[model samples]
Target: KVFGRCELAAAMKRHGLDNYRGYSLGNWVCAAKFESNFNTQATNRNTDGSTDYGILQINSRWWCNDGRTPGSRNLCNIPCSALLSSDITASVNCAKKIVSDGNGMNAWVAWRNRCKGTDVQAWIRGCRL
Candidate 1:
């Protein structure tokens, strides 16, 4: 499912994403924008053969079991396919785990490079989060 910026921001808010692990609502919004363009089914394969899945782009190498990434530990203990649902609850939940594991939002290069250390106010300018 493709989502508008505010639409995705609101959904992220509903899932308790605000100020999660010191990352603000706008931070996640900005990250998701760069990570998947708010496309729930978006996926990207790394050169190492590890795959990133869904909105938050949870990685198959350690976060989810794709049965494709070599020796995946499935730290999130969820199937990688689960992240593709239109409802972002799954992605949000797993993403929280990713942050809780101390990786923080920087787990995604898109987040680190695009959302971090930058102004994210525009990411939620019109969104009532």
Candidate 2:
């Protein structure tokens, strides 16, 4: 999906983020673009045999209990998980929760603002990832 500044901003707010540095969302969008083209349900099997899934590119096995238990506590939003699930709301909420509790979100914001014109991986230090 195509993302815009306002759209991401709203999602960030919905997740209880009122202290963003403005553009962190943009950088995340940028990351999504580079990783999976903003497809929240995207997935890729790494060349080394690992897997990456979901909008934030979370892994299916680690983050999502997709087939193991459909009705279990959705780990889509679990902190530090690969984050994948059919529950879109849960996934979004999970992102907000993780970001709220740590500096990952802030680091992303700083990277976007300070490193937007550059590469995002280079800004990982700021993202605390």
Candidate 3:
């Protein structure tokens, strides 16, 4: 799904992502923006030869299967395509699982490089919570 910033924020809030696993809502919004600009169809070819999938940019190497990537762990146990859709329930569920594994949002390089220490509140400043 292609979503504007506020639209994505509202959805995330409705989905109970505002405080998922102790991470702030702003963190989630920031990661989503940097990762895929809230575009669920987004994918990126990583240097390791695995692709990132969906809005949170879950990796094919450890999280999902893209078939072409060698030795995929498929930890999420779902096809990579499952993450690339308008309905983000699966994507968010997988993301929650990732955070529970203790990586937090650090699993997303975008979150580390761009959002880790930033004032992410602006990402949701004007959204109606």
Model 3 weakest lDDT span, ten residues long: 99-108
What lDDT score goes with residue 101 in model 1? 77
* Residue 127, candidate 3: alpha-carbon lDDT: 85
TM-score, candidate 3, is: 0.94
lDDT of 2 by residue, 50-99 (tens): 45656556544434544543343434535323344433355555555445
Please give the lDDT score for candidate 2.
0.48
- Candidates ranked, most accurate by lDDT first: 3, 1, 2
Tens-digit lDDT string for candidate 1 (13-120):
898998999888999989898889889999899998999999888889888998888877898788999999998988999899888877787787898888889888
lDDT of 3 by residue, 1-129 (tens): 699888888888888898788877899999999899989999999898999999999988888888999987988989999999898888888888898887777888889999999998889998888
Cand. 3 Cα-lDDT: 0.89
Which candidate number would show the highest TM-score if scored against the true structure? 1
Model 3 clashes, total count: 0
Reference-based lDDT, residue 52, model 1? 93
List clashing residue pairs in candidate 3: none
Q: Which 10-residue window in model 1 sums to the lowest lDDT?
A: 120-129
- As a TM-score, model 1 comes out at 0.95
